[PDB]
């Protein structure tokens, strides 16, 4: 009868246990090892300067209050057990509006090893800020960050470390590309310390390197502008007595350039500076007007 044995083990674990206190509170900094498995790298919204990402966010730490000895070495428990114990309060510094999935049940796993080691992983959709400098649009490249860390615990209480080699700790699935106008070149990680009025905090950082693909803007903007310039230049091979014909040519090409500029200014956010596409359209307009 493993039912009663294991129920007694769990009730022994949670008996006298205080989840308000971190493991090693009085005598040790809580070491939290983390890794990230990106299952999909969702779309990038340059209008909102943000990106989506779907992750298994994995954390692990030692808690000696949960040492057990029994017929198995690791308890693969339900997510409801996680609410009874202490877990780290990790949050994303540059995260805007993230979703923890609850369908069909909370997308969380907790595993307890007999020596008190805890593995706690959750499935998240993180939407995060990516401030983009669009001066070379549409031939620009960006490094979108993801920064996380504890909210309530300074570094003297809780530190974060990558669970594997830092270069192997954030892993992107080969099938998980929901990007349309970008390419994910790669990732880098780092670790550091921020300082606020409440103390010094460990912060873990990932940078995802993106390179915008130019095909949409060549098909939609550059080719129409180039052909409008060529049409403007066709007018030089008409008879000089065709004054209405060449007037039509000139004014219709100038108005087409204006239309194309107005419609191309909508692919971008409403930035306050000029981009490479803007300069190209300006020079094409100059040619047509000339």
């Amino acid at each position, epitope marked *: 009868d493993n039912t009663t044995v294991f129920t007694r083990i769990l009730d022994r674990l949670l008996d006298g246990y205080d989840n308000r206190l971190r493991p090693g509170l009085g005598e040790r900094v809580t070491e939290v090892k983390t890794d990230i498995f990106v299952t999909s790298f969702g779309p990038v919204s340059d209008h909102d300067m943000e990106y989506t990402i779907d992750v298994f966010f994995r954390q692990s730490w*030692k808690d000696e209050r949960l040492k057990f000895k029994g017929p198995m070495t690791v308890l693969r428990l339900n997510n409801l057990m996680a609410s009874k114990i202490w877990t780290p309060d990790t949050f994303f510094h540059n995260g805007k509006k993230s979703v923890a999935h609850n369908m069909t049940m909370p997308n969380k796993l907790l595993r307890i090893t007999e*020596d008190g*080691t805890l593995l706690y992983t959750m499935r998240l959709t993180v939407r995060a800020e990516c401030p983009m400098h669009l001066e070379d649009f549409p031939m620009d490249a960006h490094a979108c960050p993801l920064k996380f860390g504890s909210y309530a615990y300074t570094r003297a209480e809780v530190v974060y*470390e*990558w669970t594997r*080699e*830092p*270069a*192997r700790s954030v892993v992107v699935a080969e099938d998980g590309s929901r990007l349309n106008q970008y390419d994910l070149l790669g990732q*880098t*990680v*780092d*670790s*550091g310390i921020v300082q606020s009025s409440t103390g010094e905090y460990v912060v873990m950082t990932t940078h995802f390197h993106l390179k915008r693909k130019i095909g949409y803007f060549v098909i939609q903007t550059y080719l129409p502008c180039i052909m409008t310039v060529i049409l403007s230049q066709v007018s030089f091979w008409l008879n000089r007595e065709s004054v209405p014909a060449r007037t039509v040519f000139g004014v219709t090409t100038v108005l087409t350039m204006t239309t194309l500029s107005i419609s191309a200014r909508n692919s971008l956010p409403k930035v306050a500076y000029a981009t490479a596409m803007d300069w190209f359209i300006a020079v094409c307009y100059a040619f047509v007007f000339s």
Partner: antibody
């Protein structure tokens, strides 16, 4: 807190050697164990690392097939066995553990093996 | 594999002056660079873990500074017991070390 390696070695070429590293003051499952080597009057060169919680090992592409790392989680020890050692395999072999920011904070004492006659 | 180029190969600092030792990496290593000190007949001791973090119990004269690919160890007051080689190593990927830097005393 403390790492203690095996005594110096005198291993004729062609044979296989096995060095040990006993830990005192921590459980090796809670960290990675690195084996480094150092030829006389040179720099350090990483041989391999092991995670004793799972037994998963990694080696420099230079020492793959030459060296093999194992652990004993009961005696709290790590083993580096150099199976097919040539004569050029004379160095001091250090045992270290991963530390604060993936730095090697605690080192062994160095088992200087000798390959001669 | 990330190559750590340490420089210079040899330095001879008189007692009391400032010294700067350089380390560069071929690839990105964010801040996972360590500086180790090795006296003769002894094993390396962790001086600096990460970029710019004095390991517990080392003299406060050693300081570290770093970048994605450039790192410096500075001894603000070179004393006499620094008759030791110094090593630089990255931990961003599988660890690799520099060639070493022997510090002498005129």
């Amino acid at each position: 807190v403390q790492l203690q390696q095996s005594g110096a070695e005198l291993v004729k070429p062609g044979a296989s050697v096995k060095l040990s590293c006993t830990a005192s003051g921590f459980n090796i499952k809670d960290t990675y164990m690195y084996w480094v080597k150092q030829r006389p009057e040179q720099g350090l060169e990483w041989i391999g690392r092991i995670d004793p919680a799972n037994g998963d090992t990694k080696y420099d592409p230079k020492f793959q097939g030459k060296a093999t790392i194992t652990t004993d989680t009961f005696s709290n020890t790590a083993y580096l066995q150099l199976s097919s050692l040539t004569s050029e395999d004379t160095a001091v072999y250090y045992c270290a553990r991963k530390g604060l920011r993936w730095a090697m904070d605690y080192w062994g004492q160095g088992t200087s093996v000798t390959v001669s006659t | 594999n990330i190559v750590m180029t340490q420089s210079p190969k040899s330095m001879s600092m008189s007692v009391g002056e400032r010294v700067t030792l350089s380390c560069k990496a071929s690839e990105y290593v964010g801040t996972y660079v360590s500086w180790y000190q090795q006296k003769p007949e002894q094993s390396p001791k962790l001086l600096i873990y990460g970029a710019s973090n004095r390991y517990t119990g080392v003299p406060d004269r050693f300081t570290g500074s770093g970048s994605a690919t450039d790192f410096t160890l500075t001894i603000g007051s070179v004393q006499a017991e620094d008759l030791a080689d110094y090593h630089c190593g990255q931990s961003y990927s599988y660890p690799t070390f520099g060639a070493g830097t022997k510090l002498e005393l005129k």
